[PDB]
RNA sequence: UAGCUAGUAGGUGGGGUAACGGCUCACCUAGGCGACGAUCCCUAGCUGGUCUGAGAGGAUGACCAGCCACACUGGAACUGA
RNA sequence: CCCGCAGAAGAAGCACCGGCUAACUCCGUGCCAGCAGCCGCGGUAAUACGGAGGGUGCAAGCGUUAAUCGGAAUUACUGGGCGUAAAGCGCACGCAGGCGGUUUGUUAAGUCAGAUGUGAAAUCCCCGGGCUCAACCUGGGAACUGCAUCUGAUACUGGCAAG
């Protein structure tokens, strides 16, 4: 999007899933791909692949275990306009741990299970659930 | 050498003195938005040797005049 | 609503008028009870009620209802205004205490006897 | 403090036998259990979702003779502890000396225990205690001082106890007439029909 | 005039004293510098009546601090005991 | 063996030409101690029949709940026609800290230890539904783990 | 309350205080402050804390303690660490 | 504080009872006297006023008034809205401001981690201890969610440079 290229991808993921699409496409980033790894390895989505040189477009292959989607509700938290940063202990829990958060830690982007084990807080990218 | 508050000189007209404007984030205590709060502060420059708009490195000294308690150690940018 | 908009002017407080202006945090007030009214209520009610202008100490003149089982005041007896609006008169919002200052209690009154200035028939 | 109490129109309202009176009183024998607490007879009680926790809160208060100030203090210091708030209430009500002197088998009702306690009779850990609220810590050894060992009551009221059940969290050596509150009472052995999760909602408004 | 006087803090009829290091000019229940031990005048082996932290008292005394009247006895009643 | 609890009742009216006919509503909630709810709402002309009809429509719409061990898996939030509802699992022993229309639905589903709140209009007819929305949108750790790698 | 400010902002020198400093004097420079709210008006002692609240917050600042300010109203200074 | 002597000997009120809310019957009154926090009562029974009996609640107290927060998500940061319920300037342009695609390098200001000082004592909480219990006093801890300095990281945000 013109001012939030990451809430834009999240909106892609949970618009193209109300419509029940198999796969969605968007112009990729480095942070977009860094997220996509954390999504696709916590099983929130099948697998992705980025492709393109002048216009490297990210395409996620959405997942769903029934008519229901596996991704219930992703929430963009650290909006440009209100940047949200947390410490290693005040890291949010999503659905009391059932769902995943995505934070930008000094050692990269990861979940909060792993960034709470790693003892290193971050920048709350989005709640994944 | 205490923290050598980097700043950008606003007005080098006044004799042997300048006005350095420090800029700072601070998270807004009640709303949470990182706001930009400037810290304008008079600096004694001994030779009028810095022109408007160059980042300098200033230090705390004893008061040197009414409302002038900072002198700079060294300049790290040219005005233009 | 935008957090930037709240920054540029704070989310303001909601001001609220006190209900009993002539008391100003004084739980009671003395007065002069300068003369007595018997004005009738609104349409839904009847049974004209006993109210009296009072010159309170702090200069405010107000009307105060003299509720009870019967009436005993006069036109210059000093009375103790209380608060606690009455619901019928168009603004009798002070409710004189019974049996504290020079206003006597009520006659032959056995129940809720504390809310009136009568005290323990031998029983 | 104790207020001389509602007598058996107390227990008649709650229905169950709230022990102000103990003897052959379990069967009616001039008690008239739930004929009428007064003006109207067996009027159907349409208690609201509120009335049915006031009923149980004042079943509990009026078993032991606690009051609203002491019962709310017990509530708060049961709700600042760790664990099941209701079982904490019943625990710190069961450890009360007025209670324990009864559960010991001494006396015949907790009014008699509250009077024996208040009259220096029960003496715990070797030093006389005449506060009825004295929370008996575990491993204490309650007793009866020499002056009141054979006074008039505990010789017979104790014989009014063996037919009664033996509370299993404290042991009673009645032959020597000194007891030992051995450990902390639990909910299971405190075999009462009291639903804690009505009281706790009553106070947690 | 740094002093090692005592401040009275317990309830009525039952005083409890902190052995405080404070200068003279402050009211005994005003400001102070350091709180090195306490004194509970009640007796009959309820508990330790005194804990006193002798190393900071020795430091302050060697630094120019006037060890006061009652606390002077408090010192050696510890040393005489132990 | 199902528990059953009424919620409310109404003096709903109607203007016919001659008169003004009245009715009675009796929304009801039903379950057992295992997470089942056929919350019920049944009209009639006089309350015993409305109550019976609401018991009946109730015992039916058993839309299954996912009780954890007497409480919620996670802090559900519900909404239905202008009645927001927040629920959150609570500690053992802590009772049903819940309002009016939610007390009954929470209790009959089998829950014992939760703390709740309602925020829109507190009309029972919709609180009972927003609550049950939320409680169908539960996610047990076993079935979130089912729909991806555990 | 949208402009305020001439010892007013700075610099030379004297002079002044335990001490730096327009702290004061002569002189020169013509600045300084202000939308990130100056100046003006109204109210107010400030804090640890208190109450309330799930909490964020709100409201307060009697008691106890730290700092401040005053001592019939208004000037001044002496004596002295 | 302990011990002796008496005798139940000296020690119970207050509000409330129509719904909200635990707790109703009888009589007098007859839109009158009156009540009332709200809904609302009183014009021929009125469980709503006044009295009695009875019950409920609290108890050396118990009621009323005043004041604060709550409930009030009713100033909504957590946590609201703006078609018709209050609410999109009549419309543009635009300085300041606020936000900013993408890759690499750099910095390390925001951020994060760790560390060091400091955050008075008492308050608050925790495990205790002493007052026959409790209020109360008290030891030790925790806590004081802050500030400043230092050392690391460098994902994200900012700077600078190259695209």
Coordinates of N, CA and C (backbone and C1' of nucleotides) in Angstrom, one line a residue, chain G residues 48-51, chain H residues 121-125 137-139 141-144:
Chain G
rG48 P 4.4 11.6 44.4 O5' 5.1 10.9 45.6 C5' 6.4 10.3 45.4 C4' 6.9 9.7 46.7 C3' 6.0 8.6 47.3 O3' 6.3 7.4 46.7 C1' 6.5 10.1 49.0
rG49 P 5.2 6.2 46.7 O5' 4.6 6.2 48.1 C5' 3.2 5.8 48.4 C4' 2.6 6.8 49.4 C3' 1.1 6.7 49.5 O3' 0.7 5.6 50.3 C1' 1.7 8.9 49.3
rU50 P -0.7 4.9 50.0 O5' -1.7 6.0 50.3 C5' -2.1 6.4 51.6 C4' -3.4 7.1 51.5 C3' -4.5 6.4 50.8 O3' -5.2 5.5 51.6 C1' -4.4 8.6 50.0
rC51 P -5.8 4.1 50.9 O5' -7.1 4.5 50.2 C5' -8.1 5.2 50.9 C4' -9.1 5.8 50.0 C3' -9.6 4.9 48.8 O3' -10.7 4.1 49.3 C1' -9.0 7.0 47.9
Chain H
rA121 P 13.9 3.9 51.0 O5' 13.4 4.2 52.5 C5' 14.3 4.1 53.6 C4' 13.6 4.5 54.9 C3' 12.2 4.0 55.1 O3' 12.3 2.7 55.7 C1' 12.2 6.3 55.4
rA122 P 11.1 1.6 55.3 O5' 9.8 2.3 55.9 C5' 9.6 2.5 57.2 C4' 8.4 3.4 57.4 C3' 7.1 2.8 56.9 O3' 6.5 1.9 57.8 C1' 7.3 5.0 56.1
rU123 P 5.5 0.8 57.2 O5' 4.2 1.7 56.8 C5' 3.3 1.2 55.9 C4' 2.6 2.3 55.1 C3' 1.8 1.8 53.9 O3' 0.5 1.3 54.3 C1' 3.3 3.5 53.2
rC124 P 0.2 -0.2 54.4 O5' 0.2 -0.7 52.9 C5' -0.6 -0.1 52.0 C4' -0.4 -0.7 50.6 C3' -0.1 -2.2 50.7 O3' -1.2 -3.0 50.8 C1' 1.5 -1.1 49.2
rC125 P -1.2 -4.3 51.7 O5' -0.4 -5.4 50.9 C5' -0.9 -5.8 49.6 C4' 0.1 -6.7 48.9 C3' 0.7 -7.8 49.7 O3' -0.2 -9.0 49.7 C1' 2.4 -6.6 48.7
rC137 P 0.8 0.9 62.9 O5' 2.0 0.2 63.7 C5' 2.6 0.8 64.8 C4' 3.5 -0.1 65.6 C3' 4.7 -0.6 64.9 O3' 5.7 0.3 64.8 C1' 3.7 -2.4 66.0
rU138 P 6.5 0.4 63.4 O5' 7.4 -1.0 63.4 C5' 8.4 -1.2 64.3 C4' 8.8 -2.7 64.3 C3' 9.4 -3.2 63.0 O3' 10.7 -2.8 62.8 C1' 7.8 -4.7 63.7
rG139 P 11.3 -2.6 61.3 O5' 12.1 -3.9 61.1 C5' 12.9 -4.5 62.1 C4' 13.4 -5.9 61.8 C3' 13.8 -6.1 60.3 O3' 15.1 -5.7 60.1 C1' 12.3 -7.8 60.9
rG141 P 16.6 -7.0 53.0 O5' 15.6 -7.8 52.1 C5' 15.9 -9.0 51.4 C4' 14.7 -9.7 50.8 C3' 14.1 -9.0 49.6 O3' 14.9 -9.3 48.4 C1' 12.4 -9.6 51.1
rA142 P 15.0 -8.2 47.3 O5' 13.6 -8.2 46.6 C5' 13.0 -9.3 46.0 C4' 11.5 -9.2 45.9 C3' 11.0 -8.0 45.1 O3' 11.0 -8.2 43.7 C1' 9.8 -8.1 47.1
rA143 P 11.6 -7.1 42.7 O5' 10.5 -5.9 42.7 C5' 9.2 -6.2 42.5 C4' 8.2 -5.2 43.0 C3' 8.6 -3.8 42.6 O3' 8.1 -3.4 41.3 C1' 8.2 -3.8 44.9
rC144 P 9.0 -2.4 40.5 O5' 8.9 -1.1 41.3 C5' 7.7 -0.4 41.4 C4' 7.9 1.0 42.0 C3' 8.8 1.9 41.3 O3' 8.2 2.6 40.3 C1' 9.3 1.9 43.6

